[PDB]
Design a protein around this ligand. Sequence first.
Ligand SMILES: [Mg+2]
Ligand SMILES: [Mg+2]
Ligand SMILES: [Mg+2]
Ligand SMILES: [Mg+2]
Ligand SMILES: [Mg+2]
Ligand SMILES: [Mg+2]
Ligand SMILES: [Mg+2]
Ligand SMILES: [Mg+2]
Ligand SMILES: [Mg+2]
Ligand SMILES: [Mg+2]
Ligand SMILES: [Mg+2]
Ligand SMILES: [Mg+2]
Ligand SMILES: [Mg+2]
Ligand SMILES: [Mg+2]
Ligand SMILES: [Mg+2]
Ligand SMILES: [Mg+2]
Ligand SMILES: [Mg+2]
Ligand SMILES: [Mg+2]
Lengths: 133, 48, 136, 48, 53
Amino acid sequence: XXXXXXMKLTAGELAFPGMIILRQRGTKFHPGANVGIGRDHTIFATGVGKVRVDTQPGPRGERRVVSVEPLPEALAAADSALRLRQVEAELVKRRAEVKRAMLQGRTPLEPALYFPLPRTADGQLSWLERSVA
Amino acid sequence: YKSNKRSLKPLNTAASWQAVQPLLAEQRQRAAVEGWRPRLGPIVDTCL
Amino acid sequence: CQAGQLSKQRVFKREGINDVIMPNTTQLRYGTYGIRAMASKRVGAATIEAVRRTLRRKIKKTARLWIRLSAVVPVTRKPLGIRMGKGKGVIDFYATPVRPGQIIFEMDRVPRKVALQALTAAQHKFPVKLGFVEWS
Amino acid sequence: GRGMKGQKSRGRGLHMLYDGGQLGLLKFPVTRQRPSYEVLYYHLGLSR
Amino acid sequence: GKKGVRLLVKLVSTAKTGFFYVTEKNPRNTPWKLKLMKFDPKVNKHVLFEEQK
RNA sequence: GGUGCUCGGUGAAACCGAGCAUCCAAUACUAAAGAAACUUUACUGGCUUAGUACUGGGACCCCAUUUUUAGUAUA
RNA sequence: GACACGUGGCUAGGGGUGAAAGGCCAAUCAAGUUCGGUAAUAGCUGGUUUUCUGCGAAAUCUAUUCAGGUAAAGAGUGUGUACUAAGACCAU
RNA sequence: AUACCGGUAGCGCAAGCGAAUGGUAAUGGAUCUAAUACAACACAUUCAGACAAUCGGCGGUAAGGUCAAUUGUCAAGAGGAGAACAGUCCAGAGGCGAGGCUAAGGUGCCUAACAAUU
RNA sequence: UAACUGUCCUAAGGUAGCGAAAUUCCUUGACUUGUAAUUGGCGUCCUGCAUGAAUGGCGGAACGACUGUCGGGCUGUCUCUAACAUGGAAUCUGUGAAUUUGAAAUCUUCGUGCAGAUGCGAAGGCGCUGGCAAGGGACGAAGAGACCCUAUGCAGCUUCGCUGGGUGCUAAGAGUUACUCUUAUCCUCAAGCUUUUCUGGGACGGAUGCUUCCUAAAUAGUAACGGGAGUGAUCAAUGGUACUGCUACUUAAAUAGAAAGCAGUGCUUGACUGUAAGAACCACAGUUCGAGCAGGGACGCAAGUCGGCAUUAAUGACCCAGGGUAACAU
RNA sequence: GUUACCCUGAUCAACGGACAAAAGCUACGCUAGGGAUAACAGGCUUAUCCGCCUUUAGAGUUCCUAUCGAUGGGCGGGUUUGGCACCUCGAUGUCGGAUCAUCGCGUCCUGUGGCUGAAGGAGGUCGCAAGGGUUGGAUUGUUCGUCCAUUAAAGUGGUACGUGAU
Ligand SMILES: [Mg+2]
Ligand SMILES: [Mg+2]
Ligand SMILES: [Mg+2]
Ligand SMILES: [Mg+2]
Ligand SMILES: [Mg+2]
Ligand SMILES: [Mg+2]
Ligand SMILES: [Mg+2]
Ligand SMILES: [Mg+2]
Ligand SMILES: [Mg+2]
Ligand SMILES: [Mg+2]
Ligand SMILES: [Mg+2]
Ligand SMILES: [Mg+2]
Ligand SMILES: [Mg+2]
Ligand SMILES: [Mg+2]
Ligand SMILES: [Mg+2]
Ligand SMILES: [Mg+2]
Ligand SMILES: [Mg+2]
Ligand SMILES: [Mg+2]
């Protein structure tokens, strides 16, 4: 069991898309800019930026809104929405290469089987073989 | 968190900062073209 | 001196050691001559009624007795032959937490000499030390 | 180098793959898909 | 449970090729034959699915 | 030139025409809530023969500074 | 005398015999002795034989016909790789 | 050039305030690092723990009782003190020396050391 | 007192003749005798924890190395022991073992200590070594099993434990044409296998998933047959989307909620197909969140939401068996 | 038929789910271990027990203290019943008396002092004192208990509730 429910990335921590910022029961913290909210009110980042926790007026009282503020060197390399997506994609690709360099090939990253291509749909990448008409 | 296993969070934090470093340098250099602690001589010892 | 409630609930801690020396429940609020404790001791209901009758014997009908402690804390005591374990025992007696600075018997204008006389019989029947406090 | 009075101390009584009673290697699905032929063929590159 | 009469039942496509959805249903509170428009991947168009066991 | 209470007007918006309270352009009391400051002490970190062996941090409440109100008065 | 004794004979082991006691069947019988399968099996107990040097734990946690056993994780050693660090402290 | 997280101790009649230690991230260390970090590289062992201090449940605010949290020691640790002493205090033993300075503890005699302050 | 009547589940509620008895808890059963004094007998009485014609009920002659009690006689069993006899023992000569054994040069008391010290500490005592005696200590010696617990433990026995035609009868066919063969199966005989675990011993009782609250000490986490509530679902709408009125509820508790509350409406099935970077977590297996991309759709003018329900429970691996479809094969 | 995909089916509730199925007995028992698990008792504790008080309301023909202690609060012992399982299962006499002992005093007597509601007697306490004395047997397996009748009295305990290499 254990059910660990707390805040994972504090304010001023650099975040990347998909990183869970806080896990809670009920909306103690409310989602803000560049932030998603899950089924169990998990707050997850949808942009590269530092987490900012600010307090705003609320319907019941003192709402705390968790947000991700994009970097000041981003929004300078970036219509704007397409440019931000391209800048974020390069940062995400660079993060993977740095992480693979730091884990020096000691973990099983990719399948590399002696088999025919791992089952591929028209889209490809299916770990499920399906017979074709 | 009860798992007695080393967290990968320090590696993830280091990867994120190292990933954004080329963008930071390029944009800071672009602003510097388009537009902290004082240190003393290292003495061997302070007793004559 | 009994828990005047509907549930036979259970407790975890039986202690009250914490000091309230500053203006914090230290002045008299209902009477003018008070009797207070000086050290923390959890005390049972039978002692509270025994001291109450023992000091009431030295009190006239024109003297109100403002008691300040009510026995509402269940204490669970296991029977003689029960082996250690198998859950918590039945509630045997009711007790109160006493703090070092709490006034527990405060009196009206019954004379201070008689109030000091009643304190001696109260302190004789009580496990922890007692002290004299007045409105002043 | 064996320690004190276990079952490892008695020698040759316990297989290496026994894990206590949870048969974890027997919890994964069995696939009977035979791979296609041409994996029995010799594969030669145009580069060679 | 045994008191709960709700069971799982199958929704067979009208179109053809036997693609189906398995969804639960209360028999007492729904004596309809359950019919909904769901996506059929064999034809990649939405068709109807009636209830058969 | 400001916010609202709503009559309508379109574009779904928000503002427009009204007409009252102050925002400005008041003083003088009272009952609420907040803000920052602070004496003392609980409470604590280290040390500890369990604190006439010590030492760092430090509340709450009251008093006093002040803000958002509301109510009662003035010519 | 429902007697005792002597000499040969018969009933043999999952069997004999028993006025019936888990009695007797060659001094260890609710399953004789000997040999073979057999170097049975024992998560249990006992034991393990020359020296020096370097490093050095754990008795937590999860699962288990399982809690005196085992396996995975944590903590050890050697080897490799790699940072003035995926490190330790202190300050803001 | 610091920022977020927590709702306990205490307080309140309640609603609610609310520490100290703490966690996490950034920045700075000519502070430490005869080592550390990682390893789908290999070989293990362990998976019966005990007690002391500070804070607790169940016990009798009993038990070298049993079960939590933090720290230490023993386990796997000799030496000095505690008369003797697993777990207390000081202190971590490569060896030899009829050299010196100290810790805990002492300074009437056993028993080393001031009628020091006396 | 309950003789005759009134009742309830029920095969039936135990006769003349029995009973504190081989067997009756109260117990020193009240009652007589027995002794000066009786809990163990004798003969009555009733209040049968847990008696009773085939588990044979009611007593009798004779019998018993059977059991419990009373009188006579008898005497060292005793009050209370003494002397003597024979044979060991003790002395000498001759022959001549064994149990045991870490090494011993083995004091007392108090304290300490794997918790009862010859060996440690403090104090004290002690010329040395023996024979003949007594046995308090050396947790004397003698058996690695008195009792309890455990084992992937054995063994034998029992049965409305399980499975078998092995075995005996039986059933149905068949042959020579009573006997024999084949197949099946009740009831017997002989076997073979099972017959968990946690537990302040074991037995008994209780429990063995998942969720929440207190313990739990202000990140997370944190135990005990520790303490209080839930749950093994419901719902074709209580799902999705777009709206309309009103405002102290929504629920297992906590966190939250101007709607995630209470009443409604209009359309719909995203209660989808194929995927998913990155994280929470975490031994592993699994578990949890997930922006985005492609397909085809739903609602909405749009903004945009929708991969079931505000969340945390209602989620049992693999194997095996069955169904639809697709490809290959015969 | 083979293989994939889409799916379904256990209160597999011993819920990481033994190999098909599936109950007991052993005072006839056997083996291997455990003082890792209990009993005979040594160690720790003192809830229950036993002494000492204190408060002493009251009783005592009056009057708290001749004498008793109601209610609360404590201190001491581990000889009661309990709790833990630290010590011995390479098995160790206890739950009795027969003989023989040693020690403590919380003294039953003998030796004695105070208060006495003290006629001396005969008593009740209370203070000192452990030298040596505490006998019969009828009944119960009873160390428990009476009641026969005598004494000055027919003491209570530590003694692995002393004592089977007597
Ligand atoms: Mg044989
Ligand atoms: Mg350790
Ligand atoms: Mg284990
Ligand atoms: Mg509080
Ligand atoms: Mg520790
Ligand atoms: Mg150490
Ligand atoms: Mg040492
Ligand atoms: Mg020493
Ligand atoms: Mg002779
Ligand atoms: Mg001794
Ligand atoms: Mg001699
Ligand atoms: Mg001799
Ligand atoms: Mg077993
Ligand atoms: Mg289920
Ligand atoms: Mg199939
Ligand atoms: Mg199981
Ligand atoms: Mg089976
Ligand atoms: Mg004992």
